Design a protein around this ligand. Structure first.
Ligand SMILES: O=C1NC(C(=O)O)=C[C@H](C(=O)O)N1
Ligand SMILES: O=C1NC(C(=O)O)=C[C@H](C(=O)O)N1
Ligand SMILES: [Zn+2]
Ligand SMILES: [Zn+2]
Ligand SMILES: [Zn+2]
Ligand SMILES: [Zn+2]
Lengths: 343, 343
């Protein structure tokens, strides 16, 4: 019976893939979100204006008629990236931001950045022209326990970087730890963060107790419950430099369910309702709209969307699977009941 | 190429399953080990002398001709277990030991234990007759992080138990933490432990960095590197109350590589050479035989084997899979080149 009307949201961290997967997954986004930050970790990665322009058209070709959706493109940073290519892309309205992937931190990140020092001229230009930096904040050294890679990145990479480039605007993407939650809560106006639905709904126990569940396996890895509780307290607080970023990251079923499952939750279909449930459970629905629809635009210096959507507290069942030309796609919370759905 | 001759080993912690799976996996054990402790967790569990006698025979039926293999049977401890039934099985040489799986208040009295306190009559009887207790040492409360479940057991159950029943001999099965390594090391002649090959060879990064690997998913869960190092140090020390227990725990490929993967490594085919590799790496081959062939029999009060086997340091490839009647079995280290092989 409970209806919840909000300003149309945006997704400030999205993986749309390419080809047949792209066709399949964009509508789950374009039917709800006004804009999306579309990450550049294709194979090969989007590291040029030309690439990004063509990719943006592939995205628009796949948007159903009558969806008013704008994909906001990113540059995949690399050690050798020409800062003139990054700036040109920004000035032509192609690149909204640039994305820092530490080499081998996640999917399609082997071409990622090997150090901050290797890309200083690029970072200094971003700082100059006011282009925000999106960070996948994990270290990747083989000796560092997977669950420590986020916290380690803060002391060793993030904090020194922000001390060097005091005017650089940085989004700490998909934060998963109390460490990151306090770092952002205590940061200045040039530091923001996104949080996915899964890192709010679940902790590592959900992925590993009673069976291993690859459909909850994603990066950065789900942490212990005290971390999850931090993140939930952060969004519930009303802190206005956190915003919605799904990190929807789809993989075919048998790439998830194999002897080496790919990391990624396909949560585009079910994310907004999942966020609503978290905010509802935290007695913080008065902060929901801002998380979804205002905080991101404010950080990015963009206008808020001028249309509205409704969520209804009526229990929908999530589909077991979504067809692809080859294999299926298992949505996040496949087969599950959800408390809130879009009207 | 280098040869390691040892007295014929034994496996002090093994799962053989039943029916067709038993028929397939027995030979991997019976060709190498003289004896194995056969765990009782069938469906339904082995909780009677009658059941254990029939199970033993099904095992024996499946032992290839010429193999000198003796299965050592165990009783699954339950709330409803009659202490006279357990004592009769022990007296008759049917039950070598009794196995305690984690308590759970919602468990049917026919299938498990609600609390240790509720099975004191049985624990006091084992203590009286000198019957060893094998302990899966995890507390399974929903609110306890999975990586903490072993350490919490020590504090909450193991120590209080051993302080109550001071003559009870206890094997702390498949230890995975420094917490347990230290505990066992600082214990008395009545406390011992087994360690698996996977818990020596790997830590949780191997299961979760660069993909999720369900074939490394088993209980208790792989822990962070410091724990793996504590276990390696313990076996390498020559400490003589630790011994070989594979915890070989097979599941068909489709049950491992699903949306909810079963816990358990099928390591019977490769465990021995994997332990040899570990002792070599620790510069401790002088303690290899004792671990495999001496320590367990001493603790259990059984004769050391009088026949010998030989491992050779010749590189061999592990099969990618093993045929079942209806699926396949993916072995531990499938498709990998291993260092030590039986001659
Ligand atoms: O698990 C994932 N998978 C992917 C992907 O692109 O497959 C991206 C994110 C991320 O770390 O940003 N997490
Ligand atoms: O991962 C596993 N799976 C099983 C099993 O019986 O499936 C047993 C062991 C254990 O904890 O004893 N570990
Ligand atoms: Zn990322
Ligand atoms: Zn991402
Ligand atoms: Zn066990
Ligand atoms: Zn076991």
């Amino acid at each position: 019976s409970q209806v919840l009307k909000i300003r149309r949201p945006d997704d400030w961290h999205l993986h749309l893939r390419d080809g047949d997967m792209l066709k399949t997954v964009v509508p789950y986004t374009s039917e709800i979100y006004g804009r999306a930050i579309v990450m550049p970790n294709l194979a090969p990665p989007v590291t040029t204006v030309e690439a990004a322009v063509a990719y943006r058209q592939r995205i628009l070709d796949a948007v159903p008629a009558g969806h008013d959706f704008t994909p906001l493109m990113t540059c995949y940073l690399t050690d050798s990236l020409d800062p003139n290519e990054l700036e040109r892309g920004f000035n032509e309205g192609v690149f909204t931001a640039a994305k820092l992937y530490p080499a081998n931190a996640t999917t399609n990140s082997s071409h990622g950045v090997t150090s901050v020092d290797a890309i200083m001229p690029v970072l200094e230009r971003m700082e100059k022209i006011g282009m925000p930096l999106l960070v996948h904040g994990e270290v990747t050294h083989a000796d560092i326990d997977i669950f420590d890679r986020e916290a380690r990145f803060i002391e060793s990479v993030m904090e020194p970087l922000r001390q060097r480039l005091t005017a650089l605007k940085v989004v700490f993407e998909h934060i998963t730890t109390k460490d990151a939650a306090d770092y952002v809560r205590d940061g200045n106006e040039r530091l923001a963060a996104t949080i996915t639905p899964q890192h709010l709904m679940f902790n590592r126990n959900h992925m590993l107790v009673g069976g291993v569940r690859p459909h909850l396996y994603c990066l950065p890895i789900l942490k212990r419950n005290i971390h999850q509780q931090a993140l939930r307290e952060l969004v519930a607080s009303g802190f206005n430099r956190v915003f919605l970023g799904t990190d929807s990251a789809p993989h075919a079923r048998h790439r998830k369910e194999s002897s080496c499952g790919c990391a990624g939750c396909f949560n585009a279909p079910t994310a907004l309702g999942s966020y609503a449930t978290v905010f509802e459970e935290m007695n913080a629905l008065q902060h929901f709209e801002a998380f979804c629809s205002v905080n991101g635009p404010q950080f990015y210096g963009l206008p808020v969307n001028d249309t509205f959507i409704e969520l209804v507290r009526e229990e929908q069942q999530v589909a077991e699977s979504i067809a692809l030309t080859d294999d299926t796609l298992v949505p996040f919370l496949a087969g599950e009941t959800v408390r809130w759905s879009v009207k």
